[PDB]
Design a protein around this ligand. Structure first.
Ligand SMILES: [Zn+2]
Ligand SMILES: [Zn+2]
Ligand SMILES: [Zn+2]
Lengths: 82, 116, 99, 346, 102, 100, 86
């Protein structure tokens, strides 16, 4: 229950994302690999996104903390800050 | 007291972006001690040209899609089809954009006929 | 409502007027409006930070149109920088010798 | 040895044909095409190649007379395309004159001046026919060579533009006079009902230009149509056989015809196309194929330009079609050798 | 004695401080001037990184004061892994020493 | 006259870091503990690289740290490689790492 | 005026220079068409860095390109160079 939310990313979700990415054929070992990489890509953001929330003395992680954590890593996201 | 027409600095420059707002955001952001008078006028002109170019390409992308309202798909197609705007916004993700409809020429089946 | 009074600035009322000057009938959504607002803030902070570095390099405690000109010549690629420098110079020259 | 070739003629009483005027050499293979004198074999080979080569930066990439890279000056009268090096001018007419020539952009060149005897330069009468014989002896390829049009015996250009307008281009290029509309260019959008009688009524034509649609596929008509009609009206507009009259043509394709149609066009126009790439803005921008009989147009293609990269650019341009302007500026340059054939409006 | 022949502006550095730290961690190891320029550029680079990150952390919360907390959050963001977990302990120990040294 | 460097038990100059914070237009005000904390952080990041460069010098049978020793000190440790991933050290070369 | 235009210095990058840079890169075997592509990529890289550095020299009202303008041009392109002053 508190361990299988990495498997909440399903096989058709990675299938649809690789169809958007223009991949014609996917092997059976992609789905274990990508769930690793995506998980790492969340950590490197959330480790930063909690940390701004630490410095603001809040408990809510706002959209501005996500925008600042992505802007720090050179992945500037548009359409969430006023 | 003063008896003169209240003419804003935007209107004297022939621009649309606010000179005063750009000037106080230069004075607020801790960039330098002093901020010159021509600098917010010049920066407002640069921002207004960079806004007008993307809105012109987005209005062309909207007219192609038979729509009279720019959705973020239109901004995505407007920036990513241009090469200088793609160089400017390379490490930039636009929300609700997607990607360019561009399929490689090796994943397609050969729709050809043998000459022999 | 006197305690519920906090007006966040934006660039919606300006990007809307530039859009009506370029396309007199095409509209725009609010999500695309927030993307254009974040774009204006992004390019603003890029040129301001680059000009601040270009002032600090030459031991000058003043930003004028020259630092913004060379920051535009650094940050914008290709012909886009040339057209932005032309438009900026034309607007400054129109601004100085006006009424 | 460049101050010695001005000494071998005056003092030794030698023939100009017996010294290579290019690099100063004493060995002479042939006689120089433009002026009286001799040319050594390597300079001869390179000189022919230089004429074929087309440069965006200047009228001539390398020098006309001696084929040097640097020291390029521009001709004063804007109706002339000749360019000579500083070392030729210094060596032949005298030192410290090249600087004077380069100092102004309104200095009348050697071919525009009433007298062609500068002091060590001799012109040739009806030189273009001799020039064709020069190409015939060694150039190994008899490229389409129409007689050159003298400045004194010059005609107003009569232009027929099919499926694409070039009046802006030619006006910028100085082929059409602005302010006055005698009608020396007729733009004809629809030609399905044009007849020989119509062309005869329209007045005799010297240059007929056609071009493919821009990359946004404006019209719903197959692109080969432009080629085939261009060929037809072209043949109609050719002067009566046995008449000393210039007839130039140019069909331009912005990668809208596939390899089938490309071979078809190459067969009818009886030559291989000319692929031109545009200034890189990081990788590659756009490219264009050109058929013509205008001098130094076939050598304009650059061997570095690959087919597969061109196919990829074509498929990224056709499907995307962001810009939809006919590349007038891309095909603007290619008319530049034609400058010596018709009158220029500054 | 000769003095003030050629007036040249004294370009500051960190060379004698890196020399002191090197003699504290290696009592016999020397260092070249090229490597000393590299260590000087490293100290300038990491100083600019932590100061700029603390400037952004101050501007985001609408505060115009950089205290030790902004530098601590900048260190926790910039230094990966155990480097932050030791540098925060070293900085907090130094600030605790500095506050109670009177 | 007791300097703020020895008052906090540090080595990097507290005063120079303080005036470089006040000069660099970072914020309007600069706290008292901030240059002490930043001098401590810079001193730890200097001491770790000088320790690893001294170990690389001892392995190379040399008592002087050359830029090759700073190259081997930064590239071998993975946290310092993550810190200086987009940083070229001059006179450094690369790691002797051959693919299998 | 008194400045001969330097030309064909991309061939100054010799074949054994690209060979030695491939030896340091760990490459065991190099094809014949590597060298033109490597000259082209090095030319585009120097175009970008000198395009930044000449603009840093322009705004400084000088005519001499310094090592500090090279370090600023590289630190702007996310390639921080040490040993020349940050
Ligand atoms: Zn010769
Ligand atoms: Zn002339
Ligand atoms: Zn010459």
């Amino acid at each position: 229950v508190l361990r299988d939310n990495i498997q909440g990313i399903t096989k058709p979700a990675i299938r649809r994302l690789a169809r958007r990415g223009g991949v014609k054929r996917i092997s059976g070992l992609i789905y274990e690999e990508t769930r690793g990489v995506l998980k790492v890509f969340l950590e490197n953001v959330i480790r930063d996104a909690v940390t701004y929330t630490e410095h603001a003395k809040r408990k809510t992680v706002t959209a501005m903390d996500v925008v600042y954590a992505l802007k720090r890593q050179g992945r500037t996201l548009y359409g969430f800050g006023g | 007291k003063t008896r003169a027409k209240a003419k804003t600095r935007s209107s004297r420059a022939g621009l649309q972006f606010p000179v005063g707002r750009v000037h106080r955001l230069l004075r607020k952001g801790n960039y330098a001690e002093r901020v010159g008078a021509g600098a917010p006028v010049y920066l407002a002109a640069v921002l207004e040209y960079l806004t007008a170019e993307i809105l012109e390409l987005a209005g062309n992308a909207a007219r192609d899609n038979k729509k009279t309202r720019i959705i973020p798909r239109h901004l995505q197609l407007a920036v990513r089809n241009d090469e200088e705007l793609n160089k400017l916004l390379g490490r930039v993700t636009i929300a609700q954009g997607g990607v360019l409809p561009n399929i490689q020429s090796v994943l397609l089946p050969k729709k050809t006929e043998s000459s022999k | 409502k006197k305690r519920r009074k906090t007006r966040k600035e934006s660039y919606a009322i300006y990007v809307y007027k530039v859009l009506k000057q370029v396309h007199p009938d095409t509209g725009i959504s609010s999500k695309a409006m927030s993307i254009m607002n974040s774009f204006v803030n992004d390019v603003f902070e890029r040129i301001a930070g680059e000009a601040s570095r270009l002032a600090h390099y030459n031991k000058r405690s003043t930003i004028t149109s020259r630092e913004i000109q060379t920051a535009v010549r650094l940050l914008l690629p290709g012909e886009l920088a040339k057209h932005a420098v032309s438009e900026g110079t034309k607007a400054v020259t129109k601004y100085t010798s006006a009424k | 040895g460049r101050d010695l070739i001005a000494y071998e003629v005056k003092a030794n009483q030698r023939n100009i044909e017996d010294i290579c005027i290019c690099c100063g050499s004493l060995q002479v293979h042939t006689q120089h095409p433009l002026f009286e004198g001799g040319i050594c074999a390597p300079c001869k080979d390179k000189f022919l190649d230089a004429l074929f080569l087309y440069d965006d930066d200047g009228y001539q990439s390398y020098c006309s007379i001696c084929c040097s890279g640097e020291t390029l000056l521009i001709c004063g009268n804007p109706d002339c395309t000749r360019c000579y090096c500083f070392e030729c001018v210094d060596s032949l007419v005298g030192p410290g004159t090249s600087g004077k020539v380069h100092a102004m952009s309104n200095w009348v060149c050697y071919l525009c001046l009433p007298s062609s005897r500068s002091g060590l330069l001799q012109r040739r009468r009806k030189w273009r026919s001799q020039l064709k014989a020069f190409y015939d002896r060694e150039s190994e390829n008899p490229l389409e060579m129409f007689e050159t049009v003298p400045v004194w015996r010059r005609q107003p250009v009569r232009v027929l533009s099919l499926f694409e307008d070039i009046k802006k281009e030619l006006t910028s290029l100085g082929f059409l006079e602005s302010g006055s509309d005698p009608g020396q260019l007729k733009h004809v959008v629809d030609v399905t009902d044009t007849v020989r009688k119509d062309v005869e009524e329209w007045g005799p034509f010297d240059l007929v230009y056609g071009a493919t649609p821009p990359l946004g596929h404006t019209c719903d008509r197959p692109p080969s149509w432009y080629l085939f009609q261009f060929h037809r009206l072209l043949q109609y507009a050719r002067p009566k056989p046995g008449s000393p009259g210039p007839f130039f043509w140019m069909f331009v394709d912005n990668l809208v015809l596939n390899k089938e149609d490309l071979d078809v066009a190459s067969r009818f126009l009886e030559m291989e196309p000319v692929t031109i790439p545009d200034v890189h803005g990081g990788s590659l921008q756009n490219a264009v194929r050109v058929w013509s009989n205008i001098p130094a147009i076939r050598s304009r293609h650059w061997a570095l330009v690959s087919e597969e990269e061109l196919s990829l650019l074509a498929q990224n341009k056709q499907s995307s079609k962001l810009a939809a302007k006919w590349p007038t500026k891309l095909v603007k340059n290619c008319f530049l050798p034609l400058r010596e054939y018709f009158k220029y409006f500054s």
